[PDB]
Short mmCIF file of C-alpha atoms and ligand atoms in Angstrom, two decimals:
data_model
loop_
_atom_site.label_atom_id
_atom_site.label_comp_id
_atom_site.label_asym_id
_atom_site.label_seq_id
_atom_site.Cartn_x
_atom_site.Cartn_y
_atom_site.Cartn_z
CA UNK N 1 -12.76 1.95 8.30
CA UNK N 2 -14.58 5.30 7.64
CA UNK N 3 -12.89 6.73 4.51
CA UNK N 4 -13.05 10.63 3.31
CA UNK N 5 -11.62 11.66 0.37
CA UNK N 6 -11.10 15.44 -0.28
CA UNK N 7 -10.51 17.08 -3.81
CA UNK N 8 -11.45 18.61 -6.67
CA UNK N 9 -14.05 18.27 -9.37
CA UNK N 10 -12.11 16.33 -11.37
CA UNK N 11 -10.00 13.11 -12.03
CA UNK N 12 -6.83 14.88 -11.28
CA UNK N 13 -4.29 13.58 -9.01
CA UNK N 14 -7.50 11.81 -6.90
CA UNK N 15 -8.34 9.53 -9.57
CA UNK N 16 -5.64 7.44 -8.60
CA UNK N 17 -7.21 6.60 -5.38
CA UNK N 18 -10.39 6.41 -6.67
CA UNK N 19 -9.46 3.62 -9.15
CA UNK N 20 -7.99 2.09 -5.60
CA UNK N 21 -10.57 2.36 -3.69
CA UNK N 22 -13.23 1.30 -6.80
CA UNK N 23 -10.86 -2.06 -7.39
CA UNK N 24 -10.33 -3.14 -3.98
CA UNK N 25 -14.51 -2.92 -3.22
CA UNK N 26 -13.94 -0.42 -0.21
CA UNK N 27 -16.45 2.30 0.11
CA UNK N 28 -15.98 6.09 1.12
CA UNK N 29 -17.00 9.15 0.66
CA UNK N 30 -15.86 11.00 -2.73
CA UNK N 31 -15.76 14.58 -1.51
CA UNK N 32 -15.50 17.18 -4.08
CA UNK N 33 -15.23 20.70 -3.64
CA UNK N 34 -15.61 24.04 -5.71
CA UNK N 35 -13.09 27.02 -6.00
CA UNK N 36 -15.15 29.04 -3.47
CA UNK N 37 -14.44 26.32 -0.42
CA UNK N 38 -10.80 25.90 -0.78
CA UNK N 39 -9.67 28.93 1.10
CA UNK N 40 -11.34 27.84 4.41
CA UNK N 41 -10.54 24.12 4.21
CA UNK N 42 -6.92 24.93 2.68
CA UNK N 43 -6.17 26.66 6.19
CA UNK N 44 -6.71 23.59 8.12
CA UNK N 45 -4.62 21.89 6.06
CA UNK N 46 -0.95 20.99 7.52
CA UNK N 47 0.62 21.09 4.14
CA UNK N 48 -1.90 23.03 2.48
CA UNK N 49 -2.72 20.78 -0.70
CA UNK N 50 -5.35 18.24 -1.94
CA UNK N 51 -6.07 15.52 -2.21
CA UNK N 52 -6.14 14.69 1.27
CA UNK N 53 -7.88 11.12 2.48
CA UNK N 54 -9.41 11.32 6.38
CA UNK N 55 -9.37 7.53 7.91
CA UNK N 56 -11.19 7.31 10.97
CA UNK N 57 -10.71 11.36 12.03
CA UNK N 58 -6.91 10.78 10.88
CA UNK N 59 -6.01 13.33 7.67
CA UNK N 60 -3.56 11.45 5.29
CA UNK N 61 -2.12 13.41 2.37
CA UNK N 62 0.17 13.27 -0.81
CA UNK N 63 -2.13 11.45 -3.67
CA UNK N 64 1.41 8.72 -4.16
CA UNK N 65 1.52 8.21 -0.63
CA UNK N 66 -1.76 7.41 -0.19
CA UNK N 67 -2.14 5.48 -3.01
CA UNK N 68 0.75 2.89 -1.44
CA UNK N 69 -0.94 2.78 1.99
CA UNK N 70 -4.00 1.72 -0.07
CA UNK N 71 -2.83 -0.81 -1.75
CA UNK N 72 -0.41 -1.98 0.86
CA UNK N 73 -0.59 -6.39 1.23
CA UNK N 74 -3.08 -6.11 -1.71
CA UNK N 75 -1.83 -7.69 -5.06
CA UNK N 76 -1.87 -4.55 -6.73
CA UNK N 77 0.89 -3.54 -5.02
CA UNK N 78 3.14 -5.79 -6.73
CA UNK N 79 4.01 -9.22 -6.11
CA UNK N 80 7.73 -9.03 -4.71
CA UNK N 81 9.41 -6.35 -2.64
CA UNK N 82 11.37 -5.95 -5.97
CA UNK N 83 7.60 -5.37 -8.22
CA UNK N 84 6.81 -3.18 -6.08
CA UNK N 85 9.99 -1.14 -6.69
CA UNK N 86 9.19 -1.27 -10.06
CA UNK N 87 5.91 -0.34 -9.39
CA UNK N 88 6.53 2.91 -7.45
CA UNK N 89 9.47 3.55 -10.26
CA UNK N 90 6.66 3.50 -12.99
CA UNK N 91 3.99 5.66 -10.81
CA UNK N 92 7.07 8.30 -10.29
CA UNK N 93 8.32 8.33 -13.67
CA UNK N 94 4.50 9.32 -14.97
CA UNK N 95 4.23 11.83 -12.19
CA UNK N 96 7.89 13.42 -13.39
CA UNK N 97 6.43 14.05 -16.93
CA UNK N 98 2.78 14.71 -15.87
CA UNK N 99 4.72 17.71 -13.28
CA UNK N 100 6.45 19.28 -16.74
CA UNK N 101 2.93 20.50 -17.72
CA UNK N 102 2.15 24.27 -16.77
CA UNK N 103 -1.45 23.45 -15.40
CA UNK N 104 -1.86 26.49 -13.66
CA UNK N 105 -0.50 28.73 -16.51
CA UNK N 106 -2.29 31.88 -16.89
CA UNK N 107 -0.73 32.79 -20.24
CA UNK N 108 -3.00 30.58 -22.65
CA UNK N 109 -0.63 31.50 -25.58
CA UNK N 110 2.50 30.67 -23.23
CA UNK N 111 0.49 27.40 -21.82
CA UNK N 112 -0.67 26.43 -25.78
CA UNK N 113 2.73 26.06 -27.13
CA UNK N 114 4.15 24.72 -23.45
CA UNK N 115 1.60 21.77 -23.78
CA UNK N 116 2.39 21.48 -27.99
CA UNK N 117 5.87 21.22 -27.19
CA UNK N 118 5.85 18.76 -24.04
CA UNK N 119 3.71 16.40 -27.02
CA UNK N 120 5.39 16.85 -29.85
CA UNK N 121 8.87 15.61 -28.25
CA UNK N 122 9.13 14.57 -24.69
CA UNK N 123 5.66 12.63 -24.40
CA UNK N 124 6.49 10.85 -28.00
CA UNK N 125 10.23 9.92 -25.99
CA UNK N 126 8.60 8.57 -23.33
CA UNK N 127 6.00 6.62 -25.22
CA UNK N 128 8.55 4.46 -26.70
CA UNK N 129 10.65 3.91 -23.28
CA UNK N 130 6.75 2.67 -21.59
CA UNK N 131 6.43 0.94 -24.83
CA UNK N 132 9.75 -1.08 -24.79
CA UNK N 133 9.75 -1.43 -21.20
CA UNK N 134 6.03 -3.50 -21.22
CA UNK N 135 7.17 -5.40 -24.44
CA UNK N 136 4.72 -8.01 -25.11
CA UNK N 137 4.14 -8.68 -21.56
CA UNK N 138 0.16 -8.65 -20.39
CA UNK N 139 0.94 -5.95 -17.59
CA UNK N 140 4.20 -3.18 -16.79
CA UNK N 141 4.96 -5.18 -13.97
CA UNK N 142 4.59 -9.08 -12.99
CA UNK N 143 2.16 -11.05 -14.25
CA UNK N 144 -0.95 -9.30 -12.69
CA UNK N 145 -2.30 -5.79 -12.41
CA UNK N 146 -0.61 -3.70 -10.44
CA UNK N 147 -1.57 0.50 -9.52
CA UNK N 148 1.20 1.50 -12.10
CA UNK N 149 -0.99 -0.12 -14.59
CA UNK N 150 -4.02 1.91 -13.47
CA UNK N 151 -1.29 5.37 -13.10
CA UNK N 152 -0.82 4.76 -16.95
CA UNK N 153 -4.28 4.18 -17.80
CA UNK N 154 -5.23 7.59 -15.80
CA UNK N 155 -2.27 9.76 -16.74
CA UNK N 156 -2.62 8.64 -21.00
CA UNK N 157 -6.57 9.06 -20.44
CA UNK N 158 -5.33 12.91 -19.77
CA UNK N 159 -3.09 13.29 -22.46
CA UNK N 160 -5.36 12.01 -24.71
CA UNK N 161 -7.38 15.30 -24.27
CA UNK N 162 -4.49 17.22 -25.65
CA UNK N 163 -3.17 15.07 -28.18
CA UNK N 164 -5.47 12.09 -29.26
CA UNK N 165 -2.97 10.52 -32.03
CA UNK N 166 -0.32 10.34 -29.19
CA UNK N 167 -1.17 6.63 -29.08
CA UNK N 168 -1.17 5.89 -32.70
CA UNK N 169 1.52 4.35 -33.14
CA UNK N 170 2.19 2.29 -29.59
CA UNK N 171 -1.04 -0.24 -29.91
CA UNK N 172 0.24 -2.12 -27.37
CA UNK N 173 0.18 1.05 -25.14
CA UNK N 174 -3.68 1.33 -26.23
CA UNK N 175 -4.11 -2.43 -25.93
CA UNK N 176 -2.98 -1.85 -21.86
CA UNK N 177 -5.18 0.99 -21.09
CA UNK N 178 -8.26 -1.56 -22.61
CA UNK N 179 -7.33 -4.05 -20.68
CA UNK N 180 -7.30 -1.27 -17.45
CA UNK N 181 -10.20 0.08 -18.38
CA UNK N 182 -12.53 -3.60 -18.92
CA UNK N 183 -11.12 -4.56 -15.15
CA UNK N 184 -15.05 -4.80 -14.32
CA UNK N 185 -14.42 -2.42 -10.63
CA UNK N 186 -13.06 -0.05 -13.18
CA UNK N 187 -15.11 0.08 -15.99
CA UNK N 188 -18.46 0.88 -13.35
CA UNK N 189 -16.25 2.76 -11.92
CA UNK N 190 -15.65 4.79 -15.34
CA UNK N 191 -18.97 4.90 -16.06
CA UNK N 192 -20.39 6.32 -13.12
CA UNK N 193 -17.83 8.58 -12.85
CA UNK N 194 -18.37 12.52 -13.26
CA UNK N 195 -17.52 13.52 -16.19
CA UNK N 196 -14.59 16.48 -16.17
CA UNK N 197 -11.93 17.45 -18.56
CA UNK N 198 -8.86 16.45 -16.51
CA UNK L 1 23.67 -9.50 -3.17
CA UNK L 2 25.40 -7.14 -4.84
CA UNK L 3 24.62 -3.88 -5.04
CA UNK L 4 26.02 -1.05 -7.40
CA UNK L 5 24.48 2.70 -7.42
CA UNK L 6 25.60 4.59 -10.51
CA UNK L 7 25.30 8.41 -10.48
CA UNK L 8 27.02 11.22 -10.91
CA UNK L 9 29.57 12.88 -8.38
CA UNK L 10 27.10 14.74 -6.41
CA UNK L 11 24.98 13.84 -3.07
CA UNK L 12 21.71 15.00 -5.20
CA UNK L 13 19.46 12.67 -5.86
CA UNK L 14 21.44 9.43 -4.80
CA UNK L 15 21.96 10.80 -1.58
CA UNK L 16 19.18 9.11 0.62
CA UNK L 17 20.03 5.80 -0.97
CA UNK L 18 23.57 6.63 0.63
CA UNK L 19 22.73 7.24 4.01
CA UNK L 20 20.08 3.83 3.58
CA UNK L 21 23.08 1.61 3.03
CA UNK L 22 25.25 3.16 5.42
CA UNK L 23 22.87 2.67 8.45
CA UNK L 24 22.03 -0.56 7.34
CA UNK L 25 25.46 -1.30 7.34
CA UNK L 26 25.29 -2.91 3.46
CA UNK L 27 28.29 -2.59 1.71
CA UNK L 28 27.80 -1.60 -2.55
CA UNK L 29 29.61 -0.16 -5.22
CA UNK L 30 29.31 3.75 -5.12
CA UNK L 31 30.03 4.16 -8.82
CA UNK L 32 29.96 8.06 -9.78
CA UNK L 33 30.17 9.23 -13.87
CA UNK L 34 31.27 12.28 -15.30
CA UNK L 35 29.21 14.29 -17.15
CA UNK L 36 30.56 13.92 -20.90
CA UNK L 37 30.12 9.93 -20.30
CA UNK L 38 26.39 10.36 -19.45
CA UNK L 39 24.96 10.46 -22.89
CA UNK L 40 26.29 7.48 -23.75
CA UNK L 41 24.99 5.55 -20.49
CA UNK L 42 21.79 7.12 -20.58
CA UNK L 43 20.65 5.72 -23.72
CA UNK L 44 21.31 2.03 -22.70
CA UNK L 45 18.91 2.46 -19.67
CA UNK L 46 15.26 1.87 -20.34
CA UNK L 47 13.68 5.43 -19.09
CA UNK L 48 17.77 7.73 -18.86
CA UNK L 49 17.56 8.47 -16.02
CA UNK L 50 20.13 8.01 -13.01
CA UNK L 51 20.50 6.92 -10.01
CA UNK L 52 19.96 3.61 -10.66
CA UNK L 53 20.95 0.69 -8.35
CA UNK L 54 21.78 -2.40 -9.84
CA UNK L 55 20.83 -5.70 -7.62
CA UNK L 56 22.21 -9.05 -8.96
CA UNK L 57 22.01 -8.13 -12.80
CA UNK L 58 18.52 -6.18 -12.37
CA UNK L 59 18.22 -2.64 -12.88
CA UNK L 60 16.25 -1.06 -10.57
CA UNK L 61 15.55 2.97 -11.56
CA UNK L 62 13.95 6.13 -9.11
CA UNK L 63 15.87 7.17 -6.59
CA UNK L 64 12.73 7.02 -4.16
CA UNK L 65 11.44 3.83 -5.47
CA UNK L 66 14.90 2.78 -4.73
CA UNK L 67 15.13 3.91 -1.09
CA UNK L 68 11.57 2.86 0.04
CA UNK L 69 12.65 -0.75 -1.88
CA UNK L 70 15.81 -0.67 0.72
CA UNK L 71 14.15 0.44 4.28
CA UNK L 72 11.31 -1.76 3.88
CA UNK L 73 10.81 -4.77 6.73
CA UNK L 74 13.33 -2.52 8.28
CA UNK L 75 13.13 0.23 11.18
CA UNK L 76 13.45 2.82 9.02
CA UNK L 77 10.30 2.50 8.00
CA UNK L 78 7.43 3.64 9.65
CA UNK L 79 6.31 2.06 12.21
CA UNK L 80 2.47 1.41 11.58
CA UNK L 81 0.42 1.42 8.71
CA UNK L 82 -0.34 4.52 8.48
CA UNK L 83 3.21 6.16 9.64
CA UNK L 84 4.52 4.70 6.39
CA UNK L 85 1.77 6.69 4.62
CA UNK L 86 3.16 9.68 6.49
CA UNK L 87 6.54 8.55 6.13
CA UNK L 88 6.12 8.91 2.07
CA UNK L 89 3.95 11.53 2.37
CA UNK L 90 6.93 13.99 4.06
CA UNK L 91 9.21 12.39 1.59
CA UNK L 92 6.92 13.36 -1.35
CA UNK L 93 6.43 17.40 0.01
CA UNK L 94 10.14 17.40 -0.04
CA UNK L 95 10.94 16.12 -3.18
CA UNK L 96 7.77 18.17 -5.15
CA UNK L 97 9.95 21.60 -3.97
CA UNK L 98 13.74 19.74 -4.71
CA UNK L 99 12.05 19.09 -8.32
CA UNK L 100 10.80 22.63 -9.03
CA UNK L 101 14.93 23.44 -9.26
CA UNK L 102 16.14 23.79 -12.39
CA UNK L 103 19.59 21.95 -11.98
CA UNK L 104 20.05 21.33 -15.39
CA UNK L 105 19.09 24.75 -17.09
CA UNK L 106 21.89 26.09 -19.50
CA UNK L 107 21.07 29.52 -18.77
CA UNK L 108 23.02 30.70 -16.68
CA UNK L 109 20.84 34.11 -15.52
CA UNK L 110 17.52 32.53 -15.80
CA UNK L 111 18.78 29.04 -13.43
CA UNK L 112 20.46 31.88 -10.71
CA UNK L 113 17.28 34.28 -11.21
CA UNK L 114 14.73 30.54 -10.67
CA UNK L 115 16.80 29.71 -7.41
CA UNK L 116 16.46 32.77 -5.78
CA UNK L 117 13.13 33.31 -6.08
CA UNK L 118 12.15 29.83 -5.60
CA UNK L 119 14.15 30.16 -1.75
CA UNK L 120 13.68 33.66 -1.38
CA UNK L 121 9.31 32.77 -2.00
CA UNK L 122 9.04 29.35 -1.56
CA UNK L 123 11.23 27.77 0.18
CA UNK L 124 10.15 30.01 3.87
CA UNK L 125 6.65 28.33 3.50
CA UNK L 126 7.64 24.90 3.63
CA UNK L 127 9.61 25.13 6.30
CA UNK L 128 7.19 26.77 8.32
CA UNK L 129 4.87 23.69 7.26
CA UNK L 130 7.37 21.72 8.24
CA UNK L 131 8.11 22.97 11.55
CA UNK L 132 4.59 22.89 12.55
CA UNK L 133 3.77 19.46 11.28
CA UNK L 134 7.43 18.41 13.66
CA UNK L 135 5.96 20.78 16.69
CA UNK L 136 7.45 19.26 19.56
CA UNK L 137 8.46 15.78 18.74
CA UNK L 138 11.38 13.97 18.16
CA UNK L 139 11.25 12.82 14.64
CA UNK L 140 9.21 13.90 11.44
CA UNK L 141 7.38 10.51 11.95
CA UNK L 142 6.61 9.12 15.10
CA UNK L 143 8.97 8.07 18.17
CA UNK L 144 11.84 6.93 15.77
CA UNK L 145 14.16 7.74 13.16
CA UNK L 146 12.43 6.92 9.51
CA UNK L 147 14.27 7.82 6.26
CA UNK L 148 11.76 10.79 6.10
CA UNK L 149 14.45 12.06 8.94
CA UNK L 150 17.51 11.74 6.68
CA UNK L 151 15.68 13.05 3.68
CA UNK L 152 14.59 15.79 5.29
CA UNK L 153 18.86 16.32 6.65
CA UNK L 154 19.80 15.82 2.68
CA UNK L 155 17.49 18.41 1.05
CA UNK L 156 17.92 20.85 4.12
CA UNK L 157 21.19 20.62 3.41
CA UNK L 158 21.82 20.85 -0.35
CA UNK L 159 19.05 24.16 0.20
CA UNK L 160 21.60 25.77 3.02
CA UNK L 161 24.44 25.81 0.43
CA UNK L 162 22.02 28.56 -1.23
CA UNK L 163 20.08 30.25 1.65
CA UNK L 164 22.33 29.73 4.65
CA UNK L 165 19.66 31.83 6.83
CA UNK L 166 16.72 29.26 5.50
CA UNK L 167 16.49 27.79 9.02
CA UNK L 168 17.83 31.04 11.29
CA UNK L 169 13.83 31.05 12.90
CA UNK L 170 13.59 27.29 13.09
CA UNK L 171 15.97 25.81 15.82
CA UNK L 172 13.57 22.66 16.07
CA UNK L 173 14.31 21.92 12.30
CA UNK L 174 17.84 22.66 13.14
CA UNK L 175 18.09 20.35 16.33
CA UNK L 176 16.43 17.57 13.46
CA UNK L 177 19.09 17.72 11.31
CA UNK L 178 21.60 17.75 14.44
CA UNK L 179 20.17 14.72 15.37
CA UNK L 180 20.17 12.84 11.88
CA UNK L 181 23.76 13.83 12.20
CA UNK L 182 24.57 12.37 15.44
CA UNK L 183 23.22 8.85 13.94
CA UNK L 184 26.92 6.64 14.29
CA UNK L 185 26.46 4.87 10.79
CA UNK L 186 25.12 8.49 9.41
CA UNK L 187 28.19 10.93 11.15
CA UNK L 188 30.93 8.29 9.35
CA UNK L 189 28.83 8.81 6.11
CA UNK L 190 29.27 12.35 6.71
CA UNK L 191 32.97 12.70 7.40
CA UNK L 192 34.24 10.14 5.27
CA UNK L 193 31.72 10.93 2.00
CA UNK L 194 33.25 12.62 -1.04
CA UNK L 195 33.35 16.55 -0.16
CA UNK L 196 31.02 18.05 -3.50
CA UNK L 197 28.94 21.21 -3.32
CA UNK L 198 25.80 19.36 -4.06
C1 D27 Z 201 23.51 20.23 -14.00
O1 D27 Z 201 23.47 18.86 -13.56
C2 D27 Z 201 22.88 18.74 -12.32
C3 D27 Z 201 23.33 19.46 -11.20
C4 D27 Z 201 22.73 19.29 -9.95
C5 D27 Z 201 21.65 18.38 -9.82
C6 D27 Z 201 20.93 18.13 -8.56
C7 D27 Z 201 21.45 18.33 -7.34
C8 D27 Z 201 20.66 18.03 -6.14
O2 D27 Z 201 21.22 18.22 -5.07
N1 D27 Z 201 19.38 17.55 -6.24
C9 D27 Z 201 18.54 17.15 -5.18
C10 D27 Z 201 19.02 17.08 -3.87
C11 D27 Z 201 18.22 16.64 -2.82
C12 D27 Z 201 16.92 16.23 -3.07
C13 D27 Z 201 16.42 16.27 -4.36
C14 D27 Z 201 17.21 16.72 -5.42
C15 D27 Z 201 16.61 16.77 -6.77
O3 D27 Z 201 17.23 17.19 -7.72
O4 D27 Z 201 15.34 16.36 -6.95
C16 D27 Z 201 21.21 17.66 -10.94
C17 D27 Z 201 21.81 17.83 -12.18
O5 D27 Z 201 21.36 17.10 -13.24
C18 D27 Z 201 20.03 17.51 -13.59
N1 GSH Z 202 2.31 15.83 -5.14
C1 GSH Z 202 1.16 16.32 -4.42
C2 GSH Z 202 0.71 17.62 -5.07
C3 GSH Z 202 -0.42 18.26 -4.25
C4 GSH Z 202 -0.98 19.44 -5.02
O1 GSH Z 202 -0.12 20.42 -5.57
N2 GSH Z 202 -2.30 19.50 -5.15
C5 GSH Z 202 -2.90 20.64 -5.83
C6 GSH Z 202 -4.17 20.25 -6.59
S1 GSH Z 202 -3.80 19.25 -8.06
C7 GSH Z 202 -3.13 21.78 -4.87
O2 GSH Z 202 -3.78 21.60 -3.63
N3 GSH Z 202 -2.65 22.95 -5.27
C8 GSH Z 202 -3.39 24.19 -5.09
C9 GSH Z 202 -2.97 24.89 -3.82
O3 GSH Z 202 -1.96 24.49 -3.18
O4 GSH Z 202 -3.63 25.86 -3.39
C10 GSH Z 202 0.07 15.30 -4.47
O5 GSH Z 202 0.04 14.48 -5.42
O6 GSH Z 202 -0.81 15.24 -3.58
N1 GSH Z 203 12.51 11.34 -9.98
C1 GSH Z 203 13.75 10.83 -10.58
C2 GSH Z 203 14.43 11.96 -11.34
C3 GSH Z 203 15.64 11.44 -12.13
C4 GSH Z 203 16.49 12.59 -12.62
O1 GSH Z 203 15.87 13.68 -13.28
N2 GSH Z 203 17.80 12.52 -12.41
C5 GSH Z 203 18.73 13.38 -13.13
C6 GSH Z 203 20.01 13.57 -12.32
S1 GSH Z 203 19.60 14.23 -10.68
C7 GSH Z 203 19.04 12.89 -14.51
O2 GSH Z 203 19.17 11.51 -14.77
N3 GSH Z 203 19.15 13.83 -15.45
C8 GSH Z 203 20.08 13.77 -16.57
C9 GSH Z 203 19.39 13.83 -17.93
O3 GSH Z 203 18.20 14.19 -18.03
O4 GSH Z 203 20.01 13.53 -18.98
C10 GSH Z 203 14.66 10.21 -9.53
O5 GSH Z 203 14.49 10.43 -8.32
O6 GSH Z 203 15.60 9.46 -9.79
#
């Protein structure tokens, strides 16, 4: 299958697939594009947003969605019909809090004390519920790795640009995004990565 | 098994799960809290947050996680692959504009001033996305009925209590939610469902 992924310069809401893709040893093309292109691309766009994933001519979209068709009879779905609801409850709960960030703020005073105060209480909340939730299991979900694993690994790797102790006190939070990160597809992967801020 | 879905008294987000277990014809406890007891469940539940559908003594959590866990092996899933992809990719557009609400905000002026602008600016555009992406076809997904179809019916709904004109230049989208509403096990949902505003 020819694959064609479309997106930004960055990790973003791509990286996702891009973990996917990296893990499951399937190639295709990492397209990334600058400011200046979106307007004419954006236009063909049914929904108008990236990333978008072409298979075979066919333009998929919604990062999530794709993401699940990816992974779909691969073990990193989730074992069970009932891991994999746990799964996609994990992926949606990190997308709910990763969506309460103003990314596109203008106001850098107004975005500064937006991002302070999304760290100082609501990630630290929801550090302890990921915490508690994983116990002293190996992985969130089942006894393998699943994609919510590599959602966490990717959506803490992010917050860790904006508040690096945010981890300090959940090593077993730290301890999972090692064990994410030395998956040998992912840690070439990580390496040969561009390197971005987000 | 036995299923119960706890939420509050409101189609909202526990909605689609609803309509999933009325045209599968699965019976379940359709347990509905008042606010002031909230608090107190919410802290017992590993991320507080409802709906939540509980499944022989296991707590599942996600309202989407939840329905894509109940149509799956099922017809209202997509059909192919790749139709499931779309399937959750329709889903997902709907449910990134249903999240930009804010339902909870104590504010009274700011939450009515947020609405408007958010269907008076936003809301046209996604429709018209929509109605494109439909064009002449039966169903949002291929030659069936997927629960992209009812989610579609629930948030076009819930949106009409607001902007009752929303859909006034899209009969196709209109004929849509006609035709989730002619579904047999959907129309006795319908009528016999408790009568909230949202
Ligand atoms: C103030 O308490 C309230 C009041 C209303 C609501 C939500 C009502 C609703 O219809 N929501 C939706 C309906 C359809 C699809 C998606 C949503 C969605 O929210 O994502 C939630 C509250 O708790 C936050
Ligand atoms: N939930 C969607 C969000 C899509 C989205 O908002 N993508 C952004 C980039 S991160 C975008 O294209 N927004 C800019 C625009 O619409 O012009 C997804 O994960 O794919
Ligand atoms: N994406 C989640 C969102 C969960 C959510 O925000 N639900 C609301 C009710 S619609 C809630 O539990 N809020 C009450 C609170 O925050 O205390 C889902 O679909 O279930």
């Amino acid at each position: 299958p020819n694959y064609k992924l479309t997106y930004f310069n960055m990790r973003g809401r791509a990286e996702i697939i891009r973990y996917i893709f990296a893990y499951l040893d399937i190639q295709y093309e990492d397209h990334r594009i600058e400011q200046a292109d979106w307007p004419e691309i954006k236009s063909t766009l049914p929904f108008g947003k990236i990333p978008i994933l072409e298979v075979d001519g066919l333009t998929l979209h919604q990062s999530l969605a794709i993401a699940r068709y990816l992974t779909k009879n691969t073990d990193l779905a989730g074992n069970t019909e009932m891991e994999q609801c746990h799964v996609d409850a994990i992926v949606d709960t990190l997308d709910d809090f990763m969506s309460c960030f103003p990314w596109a703020e203008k106001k850098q005073d107004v975005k500064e004390q937006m991002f302070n105060e999304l760290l100082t209480y609501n990630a630290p909340h929801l550090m302890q519920d990921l915490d508690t939730y994983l116990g002293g299991r190996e992985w969130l979900i089942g006894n393998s790795v699943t994609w919510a694993d590599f959602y966490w690994e990717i959506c803490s790797t992010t917050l860790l640009v904006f508040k690096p102790d945010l981890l300090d006190n959940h090593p077993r939070l730290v301890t999972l995004r090692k064990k994410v990160q030395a998956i040998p597809a992912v840690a070439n992967w990580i390496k040969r990565r561009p390197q971005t801020k987000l």
